[PDB]
Amino acid sequence: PQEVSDIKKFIEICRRKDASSARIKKNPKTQQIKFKVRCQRFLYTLVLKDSDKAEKLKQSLPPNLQIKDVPKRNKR
Amino acid sequence: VNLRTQKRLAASVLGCGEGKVWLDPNEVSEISNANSRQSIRKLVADGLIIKKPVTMHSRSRARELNLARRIGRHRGFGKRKGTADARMPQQVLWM
Amino acid sequence: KVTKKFIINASQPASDKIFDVSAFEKFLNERIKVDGRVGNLGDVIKISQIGDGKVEIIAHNDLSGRYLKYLTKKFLKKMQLRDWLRVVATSKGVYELKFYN
Amino acid sequence: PSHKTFRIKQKLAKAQKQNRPIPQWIRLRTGNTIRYNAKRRHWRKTRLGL
RNA sequence: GUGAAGCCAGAGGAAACUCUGGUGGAGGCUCGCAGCGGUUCUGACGUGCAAAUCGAUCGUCAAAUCUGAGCAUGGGGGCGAA
RNA sequence: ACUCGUGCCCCGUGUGGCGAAAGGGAAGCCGGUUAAUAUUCCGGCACCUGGAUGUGGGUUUUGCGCGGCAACGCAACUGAACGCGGAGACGACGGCGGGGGCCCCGGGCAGAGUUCUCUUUUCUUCUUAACGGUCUAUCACCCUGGAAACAGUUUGUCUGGAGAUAGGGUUUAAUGGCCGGAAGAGCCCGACACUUCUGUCGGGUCCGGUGCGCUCUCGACGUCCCUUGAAAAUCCGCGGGAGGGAAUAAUUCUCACGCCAGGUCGUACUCAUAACCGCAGCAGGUCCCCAAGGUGAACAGCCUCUGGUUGAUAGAACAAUGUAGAUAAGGGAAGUCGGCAAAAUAGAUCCGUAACUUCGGGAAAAGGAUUGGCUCUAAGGGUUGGACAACCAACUUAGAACUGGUACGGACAGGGGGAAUCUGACUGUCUAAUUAAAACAUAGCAUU
RNA sequence: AUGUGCGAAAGGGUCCUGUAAGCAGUAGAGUAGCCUUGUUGUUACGAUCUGCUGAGGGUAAGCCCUCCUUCGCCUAGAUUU
Ligand SMILES: [Mg+2]
Ligand SMILES: [Mg+2]
Ligand SMILES: [Mg+2]
Ligand SMILES: [Mg+2]
Ligand SMILES: [Mg+2]
Ligand SMILES: [Mg+2]
Ligand SMILES: [Mg+2]
Ligand SMILES: [Mg+2]
Ligand SMILES: [Mg+2]
Ligand SMILES: [Mg+2]
Ligand SMILES: [Mg+2]
Ligand SMILES: [Mg+2]
Ligand SMILES: [Mg+2]
Ligand SMILES: [Mg+2]
Ligand SMILES: [Mg+2]
Ligand SMILES: [Mg+2]
Ligand SMILES: [Mg+2]
Ligand SMILES: [Mg+2]
Ligand SMILES: [Mg+2]
Ligand SMILES: [Mg+2]
Ligand SMILES: [Mg+2]
Ligand SMILES: [Mg+2]
Ligand SMILES: [Mg+2]
Ligand SMILES: [Mg+2]
Ligand SMILES: [Mg+2]
Ligand SMILES: [Mg+2]
Ligand SMILES: [Mg+2]
Ligand SMILES: [Mg+2]
Ligand SMILES: [Mg+2]
Ligand SMILES: [Mg+2]
Ligand SMILES: [Mg+2]
Ligand SMILES: [Mg+2]
Ligand SMILES: [Mg+2]
Ligand SMILES: [Mg+2]
Ligand SMILES: [Mg+2]
Ligand SMILES: [Mg+2]
Ligand SMILES: [Mg+2]
Ligand SMILES: [Mg+2]
Ligand SMILES: [Mg+2]
Ligand SMILES: [Mg+2]
Ligand SMILES: [Mg+2]
Ligand SMILES: [Mg+2]
Ligand SMILES: [Mg+2]
Ligand SMILES: [Mg+2]
Ligand SMILES: [Mg+2]
Ligand SMILES: [Mg+2]
Ligand SMILES: [Mg+2]
Ligand SMILES: [Mg+2]
Ligand SMILES: [Mg+2]
Ligand SMILES: [Mg+2]
Ligand SMILES: [Mg+2]
Ligand SMILES: [Mg+2]
Ligand SMILES: [Mg+2]
Ligand SMILES: [Mg+2]
């Protein structure tokens, strides 16, 4: 697993051909939003502290790759 | 009615020893049909199988003794079995 | 001064007329300890009731909700309702009495 | 032991397969004289030499 | 537990080297648990739990200590702190 | 080097196999799952080796990066033969320091136990993997500078004009902090469905302290040796400089990302008062790992927690003789071949300690006193202010009063001692299953 | 097998031990935490001591007494002459 520092590198990674899926993990207790993208070798995580940038990044992400929202208590 | 298998499965499911597994005396026939870990979990959720609490073991007397020795109550010559150097090494004191 | 808020809710047994809220309140008066001494409420802890089968706890020290639960269990044992009533917590600072038998 | 060679494992397999009672329909054949498995082996009675 | 060299400080004296507090942590040293062994009861048992065990009491316990696996030496041969 | 395998050109001192499931060694962690397997299955998240060729990046175009005084740094940043070096790769022991885990203490949260009386109480939970990023972490090394009125410094040592103290840096070393993994997991509570099919949904999952503590690991020191405590496979660095490298195009790249593959055999279970060997379900024997609380010097004995058992043919009675465990008035070895057996002594603290001696010992010689409980007092540290005050933290020692059964290492645990003789110097070894000795060995001495 | 019966309790006696639990002090070496300038200032811990208390506990299992303490039991069942 690898942390991505900035939005530009995160979106550039999301544009990759091997990018399989992405998911948003919302931690309300910390007021944190994590964007996770699954590539071939590594899972890349970008951390944001506010919802405005999260929404703008979600709408600016490539539309081919699928996005999920990490439901609470994911089933086996 | 043999419930050794049920006791073993319940111990595995609950993550305790077989000596902490409680099986309902009045539901022996129902428990004997479990035979599977899914059914053991179902019986645990229904309350027919219960993990008994651990046996009490307190340190209150030890803590009381420690505080009494802090104020110097149980440390006379009749309470010492090791030598002075065994109780408090001169090398550690010098260091 | 910091203020901490606790609520003890005996609404169900109070309505069923088996729990004496005034007796419980006087029990806190005569049992809660401050600085290791009883009867030293000294306006740092105020334990008035709020009517709807609930007792309200203002503390200006590190008074603990478990001490409170311990005192509630002691009162239940004293008045012999342990076999039917139990003390539960579902959110921060609130302990209520529930029937279980 | 848990550590086994293939040869040892194969011989244990053969011994396990030979450890059985005789078929019932054998005793119904004409001229049959076999009453029971005379070469039966048990892990607690007779030790097999590898 | 004892406390070998080396080291610090202080006392004497003239010298040289005497002494006294400490520090240090040597030794096929020592008490003693496990392990290893097997002294005495000439105890138990003695058609036994056992073709050598059991109990108490004992020896040793930081190194000629205890021990696994692999390997070598084969019968007038081997191996032997004998 | 050719359409095509077969044409040549260089180097050469070597030129086998087997042999370790505890030696060396490429790489996997967590959660879940079965009646029985799981570091192998499932989910998530990784890594290594080998092979291929891409995209980006870097370097260059008569050439193969840049920075720093330096120690060295940075994402790469050509490099044949031939050679040099490193790693693999190493003893035992001692005290000290760092880290992980465990133990302990305080507060808080949730649950449980007790509650005639008392107890802000007793107990349990409160977790964070591999793999990575980032910042640090002793020793060492570099730069400035030039030390006696020598200084720095460890528990111990030691270090310095071959350059110390000091000031500033570089660097090996995470089982350290934070972040990703990762809360979505696990766990704990709480509340609503139900013949089953389906469970569903809420919340919470924290902060500090302490240490001659236990265990593992790492580090710097040190001691001992007429003892100096493997090898090889494999991997890396360098010296050298052979070949090769399109001003509008690839680029002999240890950089980032990406593609493909990883065969075979083992994997259940026991490992022992019933799964092995002793004819057996035999009180014997059989190599390891982990290792809680109290007392206490202590993996001593004794009690307890987790976990595991309650399995060893039973019932009744209580004769002799037994086996095992004890007690006995007065005498105290008169017993007996013989004090055999048993008893007596025993911890700790403080006094005191002869003959002899190889000066090291003898020695715990011999002997004597004290020891409980309670209430106090003093001393032994760190931090901050402004010589005192405040805050923080364990234990170790000493002194006093009071008190009772004149008792207190209250069980357990735990030397009897002395005066001599023979003998072997000592430590050590042997007749497995009747002899452990004065026998053997030993260092020393001597001879060949 | 109707008894001066048998048994189980209880009570009394005898005997052994040695003063129970609990409550209270002005008794307790002292200490602390708030105040009234103390003479008991009120409290809070405190081995122990004193009173209730020769108390409490045990007592036949091979101790004694109880025709009028209490609660039960009974003229069987089977075998042989
Ligand atoms: Mg010690
Ligand atoms: Mg020795
Ligand atoms: Mg032995
Ligand atoms: Mg004998
Ligand atoms: Mg006999
Ligand atoms: Mg023996
Ligand atoms: Mg004996
Ligand atoms: Mg081989
Ligand atoms: Mg190996
Ligand atoms: Mg896998
Ligand atoms: Mg998987
Ligand atoms: Mg590769
Ligand atoms: Mg390029
Ligand atoms: Mg080696
Ligand atoms: Mg401990
Ligand atoms: Mg705690
Ligand atoms: Mg973490
Ligand atoms: Mg310097
Ligand atoms: Mg995280
Ligand atoms: Mg959550
Ligand atoms: Mg170890
Ligand atoms: Mg440690
Ligand atoms: Mg297995
Ligand atoms: Mg056998
Ligand atoms: Mg055995
Ligand atoms: Mg202990
Ligand atoms: Mg202790
Ligand atoms: Mg112990
Ligand atoms: Mg078991
Ligand atoms: Mg038997
Ligand atoms: Mg006897
Ligand atoms: Mg006598
Ligand atoms: Mg006598
Ligand atoms: Mg005498
Ligand atoms: Mg005589
Ligand atoms: Mg005689
Ligand atoms: Mg004797
Ligand atoms: Mg004795
Ligand atoms: Mg001496
Ligand atoms: Mg002597
Ligand atoms: Mg003496
Ligand atoms: Mg005293
Ligand atoms: Mg004594
Ligand atoms: Mg001894
Ligand atoms: Mg000898
Ligand atoms: Mg030998
Ligand atoms: Mg012999
Ligand atoms: Mg012989
Ligand atoms: Mg012998
Ligand atoms: Mg009576
Ligand atoms: Mg009394
Ligand atoms: Mg009295
Ligand atoms: Mg009486
Ligand atoms: Mg007849």
Name the burial class of residue B80, with classes exposed (0-12), middle (13-18) and buried (19+) by CB atoms within 10 angstroms of its CB: exposed
CA-nearest of C93, C19, C6 to C50 is C6
Question: Is the distance from CB of D15 to CB of D48 less than 8 angstroms?
Answer: yes
Distance in Å, CA D44 to ligand 25 centroid = 18
Experimental resolution (Å): 2.2
Distance in Å, CA B46 to ligand 28 centroid = 44
CA-nearest of B32, B63, B59 to B48 is B32
Residue type, A36: K
**Chain centre to alpha carbon of residue B10:** 18
| Placement of tokens 């994911």 in the chain | A74
Question: Is the distance from CB of B29 to CB of B1 less than 8 angstroms?
Answer: yes
Going through chain C in order, the beta strands assigned E by DSSP cover: 4-9, 33-34, 37-38, 45-46, 54-59, 85-91, 94-99
Distance in Å, CA A54 to ligand 9 centroid = 53
Q: Which chains have 3 or more CB–CB distances shorter than 8 Å to chain B?
A: none
Q: Which chains have 3 or more CB–CB distances shorter than 8 Å to chain D?
A: none
Residues 6+ apart with CB under 8 A from D18: D39, D41
Residues 6+ apart with CB under 8 A from A7: A46, A53, A57
| Placement of tokens 């053969």 in the chain | D14
Q: Got the DSSP string for A7-68?
A: HHHHHHHHTSTT--EEEEEEEGGGTEEEEEEE-SS-EEEEEES-HHHHHHHHHHS-SSSEEE
Experimental method: cryo-EM
- N- to C-terminal Cα distance for chain A? 21
Nucleotides of E under 7 A from a protein CB: 1-2, 22-25
| CB atoms closer than 10 angstroms to residue B78 | 7
Query: Residue B41 and residue B48: Cα distance in Å, rounded?
Result: 10
Residue type, C59: A
The encoded tokens of residue B61 equal 């007397």
